[PDB]
Amino acid sequence: DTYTWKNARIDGGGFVPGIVFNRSEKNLAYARTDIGGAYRWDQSGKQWKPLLDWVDWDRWGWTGVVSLASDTVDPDNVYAAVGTYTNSWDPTDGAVLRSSDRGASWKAATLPFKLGGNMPGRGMGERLAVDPNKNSVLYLGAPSGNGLWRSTDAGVSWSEVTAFPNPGNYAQDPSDTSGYGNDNQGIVWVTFDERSGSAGSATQDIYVGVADKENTVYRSTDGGATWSRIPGQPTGYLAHKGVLDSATGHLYLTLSDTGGPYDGGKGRIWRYDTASGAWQDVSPVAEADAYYGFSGLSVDRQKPGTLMATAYSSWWPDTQIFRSTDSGATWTQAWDYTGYPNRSNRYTLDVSSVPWLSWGASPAPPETAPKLGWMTEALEIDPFDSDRMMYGTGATVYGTEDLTSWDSGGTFRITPMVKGIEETAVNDLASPPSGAPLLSALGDIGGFRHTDLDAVPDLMYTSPNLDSTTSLDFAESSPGTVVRVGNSDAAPHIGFSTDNGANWFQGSEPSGVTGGGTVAAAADGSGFVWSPEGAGVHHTTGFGTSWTASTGIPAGATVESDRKNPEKFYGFEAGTFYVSTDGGATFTAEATGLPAEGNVRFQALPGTEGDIWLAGGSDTGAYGLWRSTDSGATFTKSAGVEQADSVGFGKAAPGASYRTVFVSAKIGGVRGIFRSTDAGASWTRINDDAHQWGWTGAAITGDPRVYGRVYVSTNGRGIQVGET
Ligand SMILES: [Ca+2]
């Protein structure tokens, strides 16, 4: 057919570091994510629409969005600063993407440096800003010593503001040699005082946040020609945000002892009088009582003197949200102790639309399930409705529509406002021939038995509730039997089910397991092979009540089961394929000369013993698609596929003699998702240029019950379901 694409519905699942309301047009808003692109708000549907699904495999780094700006002068314009890592993990430089149709189409201005959409400090901002009087002028705060950058042609071209005196010097984790935690977080927000410009004339007063505990805020009063450190400013902290109440003339800084978004153990809120230069400590709590940093800063644009902030890094018992209606002289908070451990809330929290946010937890007071939140760097009051606010957490977007009930001494209602955001990273996917259509393995929220692809599942896997599921499998001939492995701070790292994943019980494990690795289920459900991180390959008869070390197979090998012969298991490591014919007790080395470097994914064919498809490799070594029909003794490399990364199967086409094969691959010079109904003799692309989703290499499977349907992994855009 032509294909249509949709998410298997989950609602959220990831960190939303920034939410942006346009300051001139009611109900125009956007959200940015750290690995999953950017979204525009749909008021009529109370949902979000993805804007960057066109970002392709070779430019996957552009799915990280470190900043977004919505033009107040011309609300049709929106800009996004993109790029994911500044170390070797992201091979492409950053860019500023520009749109003049609210994100429907984009052009890219590539920068000569990398950006950090998924790096420490990504919750600070916004560091991309448009001049609110002369909207051809934009600024971008840059990391890694690149300083402050500027465009004077509406984002088409960029150069460094060499007069800016401080490129930053703060790093989260200086001992890190990987480049992930030791980067200079640089310039972290830019805020204009729109009172200091006029239509078509550059705004003269510009405020800039810098990741430097001794010099965290600078300003210009001559339109960015010269810059100076603001005298009298607080020291010892990083300003996560700088927001100006133009009605009272006060600039507010929410400060933290770290760059966030995960850490922060101390904080203040300080206030600067832009007319007199006075500084005042307006913190909601005393320095000695702040065990967290502040962020989540927002001013009510319709109510001068009203503002809010968050304890963004308060992990226990909950996050905290503060509100002042007198410019920070006095505050109240969303919840209080009323004689510890008892607590009183100014809100009710209702997650019936996203029930898994309970986390399956049953905490004692003062902790609640669900929680008010965590990692709350983003909090925004609707500039056109004092009764609405939205805030981001590490798993969702929450909001309320009766916020001013707070001031009345009443109770306001908080619900998810996240529908449409699909932000999970997918590790594995399985579609069994009976039971639910899909079992997913996900980062951060474990994964789900999806009984309905169009409905939010009630709860993630529990007993155990793993942070991330790295691998799952089902018994081909007995799909009631399922196994999953994954990551957690504590053992157990493995769970079993005999009711198709609806309910679970833990397995035991060998000592030294540090992560899930991969797991495989015997075709008859009688036993399992587990290749964990931190320990070697083990096998078990029964539901992992004890494990025995497998011989003849390298630690860390990728393991799979035959789908027909319950005694036959497979392994792959460093270019060598391994086979076991005794339930995983002993392996022998078989085919060699497979990719020695790079990711590999492989799966055996439902219905046929010893028919194996194997995809993988890398840009700098062997790369392609291989097939064996002799249980891995020999493989043939497909002449039709230049590169391939994931491979999986679904129901045969009408009249076809072989199951349908799906791959994420590069075929005939084109990266995409492809389908074959003639056992790989020919291929058809089934996605398109608008539906690419960056790195789709983790997993793919068809559906044994539905011809043409495919489930595709993404790294930040959830589970993509393609249907003809
Ligand atoms: Ca360290």
Ligand SMILES: [Ca+2]
């Ligand atoms: Ca699997």
